[PDB]
Amino acid sequence: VQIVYKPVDLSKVTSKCGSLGNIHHKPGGGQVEVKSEKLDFKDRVQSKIGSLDNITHVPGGGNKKIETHKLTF
Amino acid sequence: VQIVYKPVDLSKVTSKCGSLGNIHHKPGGGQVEVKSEKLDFKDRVQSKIGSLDNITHVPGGGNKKIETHKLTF
Amino acid sequence: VQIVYKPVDLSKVTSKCGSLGNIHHKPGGGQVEVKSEKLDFKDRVQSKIGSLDNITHVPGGGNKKIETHKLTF
Amino acid sequence: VQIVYKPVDLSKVTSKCGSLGNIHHKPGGGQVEVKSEKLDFKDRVQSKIGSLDNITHVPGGGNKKIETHKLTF
Amino acid sequence: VQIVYKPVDLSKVTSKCGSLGNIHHKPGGGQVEVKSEKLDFKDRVQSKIGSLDNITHVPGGGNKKIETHKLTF
Amino acid sequence: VQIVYKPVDLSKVTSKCGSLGNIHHKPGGGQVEVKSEKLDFKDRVQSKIGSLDNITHVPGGGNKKIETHKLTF
Numbered sequence: 001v002q003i004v005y006k007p008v009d010l011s012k013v014t015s016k017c018g019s020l021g022n023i024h025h026k027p028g029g030g031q032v033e034v035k036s037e038k039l040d041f042k043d044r045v046q047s048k049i050g051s052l053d054n055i056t057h058v059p060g061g062g063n064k065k066i067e068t069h070k071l072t073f
Numbered sequence: 074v075q076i077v078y079k080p081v082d083l084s085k086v087t088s089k090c091g092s093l094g095n096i097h098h099k100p101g102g103g104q105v106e107v108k109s110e111k112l113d114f115k116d117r118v119q120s121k122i123g124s125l126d127n128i129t130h131v132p133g134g135g136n137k138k139i140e141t142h143k144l145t146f
Numbered sequence: 147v148q149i150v151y152k153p154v155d156l157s158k159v160t161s162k163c164g165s166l167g168n169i170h171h172k173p174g175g176g177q178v179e180v181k182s183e184k185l186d187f188k189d190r191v192q193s194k195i196g197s198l199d200n201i202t203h204v205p206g207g208g209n210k211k212i213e214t215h216k217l218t219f
Numbered sequence: 220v221q222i223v224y225k226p227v228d229l230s231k232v233t234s235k236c237g238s239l240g241n242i243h244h245k246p247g248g249g250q251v252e253v254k255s256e257k258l259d260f261k262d263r264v265q266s267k268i269g270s271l272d273n274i275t276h277v278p279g280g281g282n283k284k285i286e287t288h289k290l291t292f
Numbered sequence: 293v294q295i296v297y298k299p300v301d302l303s304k305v306t307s308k309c310g311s312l313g314n315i316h317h318k319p320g321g322g323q324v325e326v327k328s329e330k331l332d333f334k335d336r337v338q339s340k341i342g343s344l345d346n347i348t349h350v351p352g353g354g355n356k357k358i359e360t361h362k363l364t365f
Numbered sequence: 366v367q368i369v370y371k372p373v374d375l376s377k378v379t380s381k382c383g384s385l386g387n388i389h390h391k392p393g394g395g396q397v398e399v400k401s402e403k404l405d406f407k408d409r410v411q412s413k414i415g416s417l418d419n420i421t422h423v424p425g426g427g428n429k430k431i432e433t434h435k436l437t438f
Contacts, residue, residue, distance in 0.1 A: 134161025351427025353380025
């Protein structure tokens, strides 16, 4: 048995851009109010209040080339 | 048995950009107000209040090449 | 058995950029107020209050080349 | 000639209030951009740019009693 | 001629208030950007740029009694 | 001729207040940028740039009693 695994890649993954900007992200600009009385919890509580986990991601490129090669006998 | 694993790669991942800027992220600009009375918890509590875990990510490139190779006999 | 594992890489991961700047991250700009009465906790409590874990990441490149190789016997 | 000018005032001008608050005034929160080329002015120029003359007035009373009395012969 | 200018005042101008507060005035939160080329002015220029003349006025009373009296023979 | 000018005042101008506080005035929080080329001025220039003449006035009373009396013959 002879196996030749000989792929060739000459690709380009390319961006060209002018100025990138004037970006506004303002999550949770409003009043948040929580009132709680007489609650019973008999098991675990996870609580998040306000403005959490928000992302502003502004890459000047942001290109992805994701590639996978496999052989098995 | 002959196995000849010779993948070849010449690929470019590229960006060209103007100015990158004037980016505003303002999460949780509003009043957050929590009032709690007479609560009972019989098990674990995790609480997060206010502005948490927020990200501003502004890379001048941010390009990714991700490349995986395997063989198994 | 003959195994020749001879992968070849000539890639580049590249960015070019103008000025990178004028980036504002202002998490938790609002008043945060927490009022608690008569709470009972019978197991572990984790509390985070205010402005925590927020990130501002502004790399002049920020490119990633991630590569993985395996052979098995 | 007899002139008797004898007004009597027993009035009250009254306010009663709870808490007064949580007031937000945010004029000119957005980007202001002015580009001018080759303008000729042959007379006087007054220019105002940005956020000017804004008022936030929050009196705990703010009552007015304004009164005028006159006699003439 | 007999003139008797005998006005009487027993008035009150009154406020009662709770707590007065949590007042936010944020004029000119946005970017101001002025670009000028080749302008000619043959007469006087007044220029104001940015955040000017803004007032926050929070008196715990702020009540006014204004009163004018006149006689003329 | 007899003139009796005998005005009588027993008035009060009054305020009562709770706590007075938590007042924020933040004029000109944004970037101010001015770029000028080849400008000609042939008469007087007044220029104000940045954050000017802004007032924060928070008197615990701030009441006014203004009164004027005049007689003429």
